[PDB]
């Protein structure tokens, strides 16, 4: 079909296609990924008051997929995440709209301060222990570079992510989410692309 933008974005919530007005996605190698999606309700469909706010509030913690496709070159980007906040609002008597907020599953690992200690393990074993008692479904690649045994590590009133983020980085290990898996260790990625000023680069 003709009349297509350069890049096409598709959003699916729990496997079904979303009808959005505006999106936003942020990705980092040393922080959480975040998304914010605005959903609209059409005049000829039920409003947010005919459905009920508490029935909308029951899709917290569901899966979101965002896929961006470049038609000329056939190149795509994929992201999988979870919903952690919902807003339902309206003004001046309109039918209302919904705002979905979330990010990578590591955002749900950052809400639980506690006290622990580990005696004579390595970083490979400590990571598995933290992720074993999590309750969040995730897939991980666990390959740290420091394979020796640490006599003592303490978790001092911090969350699971805050404890793990601190400990792995002070040992100089890569620790981030690459869009579908959680990476621990250097992935050894050498994939190059070319960009030119005034050719697919609008500013430098």
């Amino acid at each position: 079909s003709t009349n297509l933008d350069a890049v096409s974005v598709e959003i699916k919530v729990a496997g079904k296609v979303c009808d959005y007005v505006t999106m936003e996605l942020f990705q980092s190698v040393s922080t959480h990924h975040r998304f914010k999606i605005k959903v609209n309700y059409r005049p000829d469909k039920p409003s947010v008051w005919a459905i009920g706010p508490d029935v909308i509030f029951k899709q917290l913690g569901e899966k979101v997929s965002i896929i961006m496709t470049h038609h000329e070159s056939g190149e795509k980007t994929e992201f999988h995440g979870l919903i952690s906040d919902i807003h339902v609002e309206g003004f001046d008597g309109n039918q209302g709209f919904v705002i979905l907020e979330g990010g990578s599953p590591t955002i749900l690992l950052d809400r639980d301060p506690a006290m622990d200690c580990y005696v004579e393990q390595n970083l490979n074993t400590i990571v598995s222990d933290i992720l074993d008692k999590s309750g969040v479904k995730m897939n991980v690649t666990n390959n740290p570079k420091h394979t020796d045994i640490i006599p003592y590590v303490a978790r001092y009133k911090e969350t699971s992510y805050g404890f793990l983020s601190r400990l792995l980085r002070s040992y100089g290990e890569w620790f981030y989410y690459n869009g579908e898996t959680l990476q621990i260790g250097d992935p050894e990625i050498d994939t190059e692309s070319r960009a030119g000023y005034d050719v697919d680069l609008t500013g430098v």
Binding site: T77, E192, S193
Partner: peptide, 11 residues
């Protein structure tokens, strides 16, 4: 959208 996180780009 061919620019991806954690990869290399030559300018």
């Amino acid at each position: 959208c061919g620019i991806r996180l954690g990869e290399l780009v030559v300018t």
